[PDB]
Amino acid sequence: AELLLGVNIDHIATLRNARGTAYPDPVQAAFIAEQAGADGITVHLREDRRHITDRDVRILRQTLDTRMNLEMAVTEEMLAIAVETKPHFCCLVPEKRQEVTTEGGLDVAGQRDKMRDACKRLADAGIQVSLFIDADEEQIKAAAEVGAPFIEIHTGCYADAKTDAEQAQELARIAKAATFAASLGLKVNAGHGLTYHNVKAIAAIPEMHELNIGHAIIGRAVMTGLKDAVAEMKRLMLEARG
Amino acid sequence: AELLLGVNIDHIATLRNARGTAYPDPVQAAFIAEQAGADGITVHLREDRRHITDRDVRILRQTLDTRMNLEMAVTEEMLAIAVETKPHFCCLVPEKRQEVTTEGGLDVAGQRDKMRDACKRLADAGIQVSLFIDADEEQIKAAAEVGAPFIEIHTGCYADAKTDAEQAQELARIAKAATFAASLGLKVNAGHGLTYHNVKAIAAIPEMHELNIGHAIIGRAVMTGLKDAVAEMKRLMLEARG
Amino acid sequence: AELLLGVNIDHIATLRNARGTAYPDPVQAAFIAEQAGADGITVHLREDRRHITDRDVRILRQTLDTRMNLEMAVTEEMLAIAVETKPHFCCLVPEKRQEVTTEGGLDVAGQRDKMRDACKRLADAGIQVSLFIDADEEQIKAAAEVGAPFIEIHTGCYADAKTDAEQAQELARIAKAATFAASLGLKVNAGHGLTYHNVKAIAAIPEMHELNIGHAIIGRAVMTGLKDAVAEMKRLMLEARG
Amino acid sequence: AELLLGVNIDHIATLRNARGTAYPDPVQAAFIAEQAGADGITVHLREDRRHITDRDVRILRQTLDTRMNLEMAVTEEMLAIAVETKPHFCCLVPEKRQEVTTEGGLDVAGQRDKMRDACKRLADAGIQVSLFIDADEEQIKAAAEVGAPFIEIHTGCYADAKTDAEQAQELARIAKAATFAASLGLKVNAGHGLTYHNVKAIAAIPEMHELNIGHAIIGRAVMTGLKDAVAEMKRLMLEARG
Amino acid sequence: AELLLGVNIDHIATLRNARGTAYPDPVQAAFIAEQAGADGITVHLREDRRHITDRDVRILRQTLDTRMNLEMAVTEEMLAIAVETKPHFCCLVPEKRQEVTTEGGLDVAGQRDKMRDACKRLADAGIQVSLFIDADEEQIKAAAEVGAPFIEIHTGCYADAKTDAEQAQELARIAKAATFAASLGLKVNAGHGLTYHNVKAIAAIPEMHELNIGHAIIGRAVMTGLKDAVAEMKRLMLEARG
Amino acid sequence: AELLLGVNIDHIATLRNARGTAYPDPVQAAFIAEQAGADGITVHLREDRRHITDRDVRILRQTLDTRMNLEMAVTEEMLAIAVETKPHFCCLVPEKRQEVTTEGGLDVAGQRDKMRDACKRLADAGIQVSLFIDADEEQIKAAAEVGAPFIEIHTGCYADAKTDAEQAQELARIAKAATFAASLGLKVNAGHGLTYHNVKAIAAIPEMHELNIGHAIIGRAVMTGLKDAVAEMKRLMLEARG
Amino acid sequence: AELLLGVNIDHIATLRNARGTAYPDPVQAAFIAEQAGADGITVHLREDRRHITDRDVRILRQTLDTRMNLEMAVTEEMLAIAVETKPHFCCLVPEKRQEVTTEGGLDVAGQRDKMRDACKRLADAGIQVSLFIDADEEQIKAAAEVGAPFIEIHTGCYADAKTDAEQAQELARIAKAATFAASLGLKVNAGHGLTYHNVKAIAAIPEMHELNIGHAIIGRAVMTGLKDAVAEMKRLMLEARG
Amino acid sequence: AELLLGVNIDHIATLRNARGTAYPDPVQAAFIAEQAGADGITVHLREDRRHITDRDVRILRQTLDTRMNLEMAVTEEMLAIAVETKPHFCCLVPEKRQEVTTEGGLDVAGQRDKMRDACKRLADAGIQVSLFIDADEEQIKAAAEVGAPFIEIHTGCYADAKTDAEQAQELARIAKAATFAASLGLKVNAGHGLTYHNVKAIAAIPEMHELNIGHAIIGRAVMTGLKDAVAEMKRLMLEARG
Numbered sequence A, B, C, D, E, F, G, H: 001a002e003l004l005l006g007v008n009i010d011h012i013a014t015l016r017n018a019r020g021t022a023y024p025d026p027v028q029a030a031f032i033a034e035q036a037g038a039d040g041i042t043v044h045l046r047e048d049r050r051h052i053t054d055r056d057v058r059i060l061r062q063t064l065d066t067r068m069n070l071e072m073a074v075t076e077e078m079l080a081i082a083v084e085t086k087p088h089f090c091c092l093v094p095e096k097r098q099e100v101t102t103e104g105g106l107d108v109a110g111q112r113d114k115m116r117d118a119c120k121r122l123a124d125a126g127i128q129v130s131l132f133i134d135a136d137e138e139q140i141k142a143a144a145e146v147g148a149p150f151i152e153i154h155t156g157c158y159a160d161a162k163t164d165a166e167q168a169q170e171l172a173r174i175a176k177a178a179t180f181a182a183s184l185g186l187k188v189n190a191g192h193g194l195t196y197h198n199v200k201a202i203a204a205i206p207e208m209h210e211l212n213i214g215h216a217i218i219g220r221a222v223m224t225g226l227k228d229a230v231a232e233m234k235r236l237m238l239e240a241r242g
C-alpha cells in the first residue's frame, strides 16, 4: 500500500480566528486538500478553540469525502466529543492550554490506566486510536500494551535538529522506533515539523503508514495556493518511496 | 491618476509566528504582491511584535521595490523607529496590545497637540503622514488643522454593517466624509475590513487615493496563492473606477 | 452599482443525485463560485428534492460567505423552511412536481391574496422577496402591488427564441418590462436560460440588478472547471455594461 | 503492457438531459478525455436513453480517435444496434429500466445459451465482447466457457465497503477472481464505483487490463475541468503499477 | 450590440488532410473556439474538398452550439448542398479550384442575374446570405440590389499593404465602403488576412458587424493552443471598440 | 542513457505555406520544442520545398540549441546541401514529390553502391547517417554492410494496422528487427505515424535510440499548444521505458 | 489610435553574452514578445556589440513578424548597416561623451549637420528616424529643424526621481515637451527606465505614440516568464488610456 | 539519498547590475528556487562584486529557508567574510591567473599550504568546505590531503565538448574521477555549464551528492519563469537516478 498523507488544516483556522470574520473557511480547505493528494483531513480540537471550532468539526464531519483524524487531549470533554463525533481516527496528544503547538509525545508509560480506558472508550465507539509519542521504546511498548492500534511518532526533534549530525541521529532514532513499533504489531504514523525539504527521509522509512502535516503546507499555500501546496508534498512523499 | 492598492502583509507574519519556524516569510509575500497589483506594502509594527517584527521592517525596507507604509501607534518608541526607518508613508493608529485588530480611528480632535508634534516630527524626517480616522467631520477638521498630508478613513463599520440598509448608510457616510476631507486639502485613503465583495463601492468613491487591504487578501491567498489574490483585488478596484 | 451575478448550483446536485455517493458537493461549488465572480449563491429546494437537499441548505446557510437566494414554490412547507432558514433572498416560482425545470412566471395577478400573504410573512422574517414573473406589465404591476421589493423576469422565452427576429422581440419586451418594473419602485433581476452567447443583451439592460444563472455555467464547468466558468460569465456581464 | 483507462462519459449527458438544451456535449468531452489520458471512451446506451442517445453514439463513432466501448443490456434491440455500430468493444450488463445505475453482474452461469449466442453474434460483427460480472469464479468460468474474450469485474461491492476490513476483503476477492480469470485465457477489466481514493488498490492488481471509470471523473470535472480530472485518474493508475 | 467574431477553422482541416489520419478534428476545434470567444464558426466547403469535407459540414451542423457560416462558390453543387444543410449564414465567394486561398471579391455587378437567383434560392431556404466583395462602391450597390442582407468586405489588400501609407489608404477605403454599404441598408462584415497586429483598426470601424478570421488564429494556436488564440483575438477586437 | 525524442516540425511549415504569409514560423516552433522535451529537431527538405525551405534550414541551423536531423532524399542537390549545412544527423529517405508523405523505407539492399557513397560522403563531412528503412532483415544487413551508423525503422505499418492482432504482429516485427539491427552494431531509431496512443509500445523496445515524431505532435499542438504537446509525448515515452 | 509598445530585448543578449553559450537567444524572446503585446521589437546594435550582435540583427530581420527598431549611434559603420538592413525604424542614440547632453539624450542641437545628414540618408533608404532626446525644447527644435519625423523622449530623469514632488515635476516636463514636440509636426515616443509602477503616467500622455521598454520587462521575465511580463506591461499601458 | 540541486542565482544579480536599479532582486529568486526544487542556494561573492553584493549575502543569510553555499576565492577578505557569515557551505574557487589550472578548476596541488589553511580555518567556524577542481587525480589527491570534506568537479569541459565522442570521453573522465574521489573519503559535487540537455548523464553518476547549476536555469527562466525552470531541472535530475 502507498504512503498516505493526512493534511492538518488547523492553521487555516488560525488565520480566520485572528479576526471575527468567517474566512478563510477550513471546510473549503478540506475539499481542496482531499482533491489534491490528501488521503485524510486532520483537525486538532483544542480546549481553547484557538483555531478549529466545534462548528468546524461538526460541518467537516458532514463534508469530508475521505475521513477525519481528530487530534485532542485525553480529557472527559474530548473523549465525550470524540465519542459523539465518531471520527474515523482520533489522535491522542498531550496539551497545555497556551503552548505554542503540540510540544512532545503523550506520557503513555506513565499513565497506563488512563490511556487504556481512553483507548477502550474510543474503540467501543468504533474509533481507530493513535497515540502521539516520542521515538521512545518505553513509550512504544506501553502504547502497544494499553491497546492502541496506532502510534504517531513525533518528528519535531528531527525537524529542529541544529546540525546535519543531530538530524541524522534523530532520523535513525525514528527509523528504529518505527521498526520496533511494527514488530509489536502497531501501525505507525509520523508528524510535526515535516517540511518540503525534510519530509523525504521520513517518508523513506518503510513502516510509515501516514504522515500528518500542517503548518508547512499552509505556509506554502499562502504563497502558492493550497492545491499545489498539497500536491507538491504528496509528490515528494511518493518519490521518496519509489 | 489611478486608485492605488496598498497590501497589508501583517497576516503572513501571523501565520509564521503561530510556530517557531521562519515561514511563510513576509519578505517573499511583498515581492509577490508588488508584482501583482500592489502599489505599496503596509506593515503594522505592534508594540507586542505580534506578527511583523523589527527584523521584518529592517529587511523589507531594503527589499521593497515600491514603498513602505508603516502603521504604528503614536508613542516615542515608534516615532523613533519611524524617523529611523524613513518609510515613505506612516499611518498613525490607536492600539492596545491585546486587541483583535485596529478597532476605530485615532482620537485626533481630542489630542491635537500630541498629533501636531508627531506629524511635524515625522514630516521633518521626510515621511508622509496618514492619520487613521473615523468618517467623522470633527476628526477630519482636526487632522486638517494639525497638518497631516493624509487621513485614512476607517471602513470597519461599513464592512460590519449587519443589513443592506445599514451598509448603504455607512457608505454614504464614508463618501461624504471623503469629499469633505478632500475639500480641506487632505488626500484620503480608506481601509480595514475591505473584502472582494465590498471593495468596489468604496473604490468607486472619487476622492479615494489608496485603499489599504490585508486580511481578506491573505485569506483568499491560502486558497489561490498571493499573486492571484492581489491581482483580483486590484482588478475589482480598477473596474469600480471605470 | 455593478450588475451582480447569482450562481445557481442546483445542477451540481443533479450530478450528485444520479448516484448514492456524496460528490460533487454543492458546498464546495459554492466556495469556488463565490470566489470566482458570484455575488450570491442560489439553490432551488424542490418539493421532490431531486437535487438540492435539506442538508445542502442547512450547511450552505453556514458556509456561504455571501448570501443565499432560496428558490422555492409558494407552499406551507417551503414558507416554513424559508422562515426558519432566513435566506438573505427568497425567489418564489411556479412548481409542478414533475417538470423539467421552472416553466416560467408566477401568476401573481390572479393570486394577489396568496402572494400578498407570502410576501408579508417572508418579509417579517427579514427575507427580501423576489417574485419570478414573465415580462408582463400586468404581472409586474401586481408584484409591486402585493409588496414584493423584487421581481425576476423570466428570460426563458428569450433564450428559446427560434429566429433572430423572435429573439429581438423578446429582448425588447424584457427591456420595456424592466423599465416599467423600476418605475414602480421594484428592483429587477432576470434569469433562466441565460448562456455565454445570449447573456450580454440581457446584462446591457440598465435596470437589471442581478442575473441568476445556473445550467450554462455548470455545463461549461464540466469542461473547463467551475472557477473559469463563473469568471467568464461575470466578465461578459461587466463587458455588456461598459 | 500499460494499464489502460476507459472514460465513461454517460454523466456528461446526464447533465445535458436535465434540460432541453444540447450542452454539455458528450462529443466534446470525448475529445478532451482521449487527449488527457483516456485510452478508450465508454458510453452506456440505456433502454430508456436517459443520457447517451442514438445521436451521441452515431456521432461519437465518427469522431472518436481511439475506440468505443458500448455498454448495453442483452436485448434484441441493443444487439442489433451494436452489430450495426460495430464498436471496438462491447460490454454486456444487467439492466433494469428504472435502476439508479448498473446494479452489478450478469448472470452468465444461468443463461449460458443466451450469452453464448450474444457473444458469437457480436464476435461475428468483429466486436470484442466483455461480460460484466461479479468477482465470482462460477460466473467467471462461465464467461470463459461461453466464449467471451473479456470480462469486467464489478468493483461496486469494494467501492461501497462500510469498513476497512470489508473493503480489504472485497479487494482480495477481486484480486483472486482476476487471477483465476486470467488462468482461463480471459482478459480482465474492472469498473463501477472507482474513485480517486480507492483506485490504486484495484490498479495494482496485475491482471487488470483496463479500468472503466465514469462518475468520479465527471464529479471531479465540474470542479476542476475534465482534462485535469482524466489526467489525475490516469496518473494515479500508473503510480499504482509502479 | 457587440462586434462578433466568426472563426474560420478550415486550416485545422488542412493540417489533417496532409495525411490520411483523422486528427486534428475540426469538430473539436469548433467546440474550443465557441467556448473561447467565437460567436460563429466558419467553414469553406471547396469544390476540391482540400480541407473541410462533406463529413465535416455534416457533423459540425449537428455539434455547433452557435451557428455555421458556410463559405462556398456560387455553383449548382454548392447551392444544392447549402439548401440541404440550412446553415444560418452562407458567404458567397469566388473560387478557382487551385488558388492559394480566396483571391478577391465576388464579381456581383457583373453577374447580377446569377447572384440575384442565388440569393433568392438561399433565402427561400431560410439562409442569411453574405456576399464577399471588395471595398468597391459599384460592387456594394450591386450586392444591395441583388437582395443580399450582408456583404463581407475583403480585407486582404489592407492586410497586404507594403507601406504604412498604402495601409492607411486601404483602411480608409474600407471604412468608407462600410459606411456606404450601411447607408444602403446592408449589414457588413470583414475578413481575410486579419491578424493580431492589424485587426484593431478594422474592428474600430462602427459599421462592422462580424469579422471572420482563420489563418492567423490557427497560426497562433499551434504555438499557443486554440482556446487562447481565439480569446486573444476576441479581446483585441472588443478593446478596439471601447 | 534515456530514450530520446526528435520532433519533426515540417507541418508547422505546412500550415505556413498554405498561405503567402510568414507564420507560423518553424524557427519559433523549434525553440519551444527544444525546451519542452525534444532532444533534437528534424526537418525534411523535400525537392519540392513543400513545407520546410532553404531559408528554414539556414536559420534553424543557426538557432537550434540542440541539433538538426536533416531528412532528405539521396540526390546530388541534397547531398551537396547536407555537406554544406553540416547537420549533426542526416536521415536518408525515399521521395517522389507528389507523395502525401514518406511511404516506406529506403531500398538499400537494392542500391548498395549509391548508399555506400552517400554514407561515406556525408560521414566525411562529419555528419552521422541514418538510413530510413523497413523492419526488414535484408535491408538491415544491407545498411550494416554499407557502413551507416544509424537506421530508422519505419513504424508506418504498425501505425496503420487495422486490427489489434495486425498491430501486435507489426510490433513484434519492429522489435525483432531492432534487436537484429543492434546485433550488427547499428544504432536504431524509429518513426512515422507514432501517436500519443501507440508510442509507448514502441518506446518500450530496448534498442530504440530516438523516435522521430511530427504530425501527431503538431496535430495535438493546434489544440493545446506546442509546449504541452511535446512534453506529453516525451512523458509517455519515458514512462514506457520505466 | 492605440498606444504602442516596443520591447527592447537587449538584456536577453546581456544574459547570453555573460558566457560563451548561445542561450538565451534573442530570436526566441522576440517571437514571445510579438505574440504577447509587443507591437515592435527594439535592439540596440552597439559598436562594441556588448549584447546584441550582427547575427542577432541579421536573423531577427528575417524572423520578426512585426518590425524592427534598430537603435544605433550616429557613425558611418551604423548608417551603412542600417541602410543595408532596412529596419522599419531607426533610433539614433548617443554612445560617446561627445554626443550626450548632461542628461542622457542625443545632442542634436550641437551636431546639427551630422544629424541632418543621418536623417536625410536613412530616409532615402525608407527608414523612419527617431532621435532619442531630452525633454528639452532646444533639442526638440533642433530635431524638428533637422528633418527627423520622430523624437523619443528620455524618461530616465522621471524614472529616477527621488521624491514624489521631484517625480511630478519630471512628468510635467515630459508632458509639456510632448505637446511642444507635436506642435512642431513631430511624432513622439518615450522610453528608458519605464517600469510596471511608473509607466501609466507616461502612457496617459496623449501625444505618446509608442513606449520603448526593456530592462523592467526582462527583470520581471526572469521571475514570471517573458510572455506574462510583456502582456502585463501592455495591459497597464492600455488601462492608462482608458 | 536524493541527488540534490544547488541553484546559483549569480546571474539574477548580473541582470540587475546592468543598470543602477535594484530589480531583479536575488532575494526573491532565492525564495522561488527554494520552493521549486532547489535544496540550497549558491552565490559567488566576487572580489569585484560584479554581480552578487555584500548586501545580497547579508540579506540572503537571513531569508534563505534552506542553506547558503558561499562561493569565494581564497583571500583573507573572503575567509573573514565567510567566517563571520557562517554559511553552511563554502566553495573555494580560482579568481586570478595564479590560481587556476589550464582547465578552470582551483589549483590545489600547487597551493597546498594555502588550501590546507583555508580548509582548517573555515572548518573551525563550522563551514563545510568544497574545493572546485578539475576531474584530475592529482588535484583530487591534493584536496583529500589538504582536509576538504567536499570537492566539486568542473563539468565545463564536458559541457563544451564539440563532438559526441569528445563528450562521452569527458563524461567518462568525470565518472572515473568521482569514483576515485569517493575512494579517498571525499563527498563530491559537480557543476559549471550543466544544461537541460546535458545534465542527466552527470546526474546518473552515483557518487554525485549535489549539482550546482546557474546560467542555464536563469537562461530558461527569462522565457518560462524561474519556478518552472528550477522544477524542470530537478525533475530531469531525479529521472536520471530512476
Ligand code: PXP
Pocket: A008, A044, A071, A091, A093, A101, A102, A132, A152, A190, A191, A192, A193, A194, A212, A213, A214, A215, A216
Ligand atoms: C499529533 C500531531 N501530528 C501532526 C501535526 C502537524 O504538525 P505540523 O503543523 O508541524 O505539520 C501536529 C500539530 O498539531 C500534531 O499535534
Ligand code: PXP
Pocket: B008, B044, B071, B091, B093, B102, B132, B152, B190, B191, B192, B193, B194, B212, B213, B214, B215, B216
Ligand atoms: C491599522 C490597520 N490595520 C489593518 C488594516 C488592513 O486591514 P484589513 O486586514 O481588514 O484589510 C488597515 C488598513 O485600513 C489599518 O489601517
Ligand code: PXP
Pocket: C008, C044, C071, C091, C093, C101, C102, C132, C152, C190, C191, C192, C193, C194, C212, C213, C214, C215, C216
Ligand atoms: C427563478 C429562476 N431563476 C434562474 C434560474 C437559473 O436558470 P438556468 O439554470 O436556466 O441558468 C432558475 C432555475 O430554474 C430559476 O428557477
Ligand code: PXP
Pocket: E008, E044, E071, E091, E093, E101, E102, E132, E152, E190, E191, E192, E193, E194, E212, E213, E214, E215, E216
Ligand atoms: C470570405 C472569407 N472570409 C474570411 C476568411 C478568413 O481568412 P483568413 O484565414 O485570412 O483569416 C476567408 C478565407 O477563406 C474567406 O474566404
Ligand code: PXP
Pocket: F008, F044, F071, F091, F093, F102, F132, F152, F190, F191, F192, F193, F194, F212, F213, F214, F215, F216
Ligand atoms: C521521412 C520522415 N517523415 C516524417 C517523419 C515523422 O512522421 P510523423 O509525422 O508521422 O511522426 C519521419 C520520422 O520517421 C520520417 O523519417
Ligand code: PXP
Pocket: G008, G010, G044, G071, G091, G093, G132, G152, G190, G191, G192, G193, G194, G212, G213, G214, G215, G216
Ligand atoms: C533610446 C532608448 N529607448 C528605450 C530604452 C529602454 O530602456 P529600459 O531598458 O530602461 O526599459 C533604451 C535602452 O536601451 C533606449 O536606449
Ligand code: PXP
Pocket: H008, H010, H044, H071, H091, H093, H132, H152, H190, H191, H192, H193, H194, H212, H213, H214, H215, H216
Ligand atoms: C564552482 C561553481 N559551480 C557551479 C557553477 C554554476 O555554473 P553554471 O552557471 O554554468 O550553471 C559555478 C558558476 O558560478 C561555479 O563557479
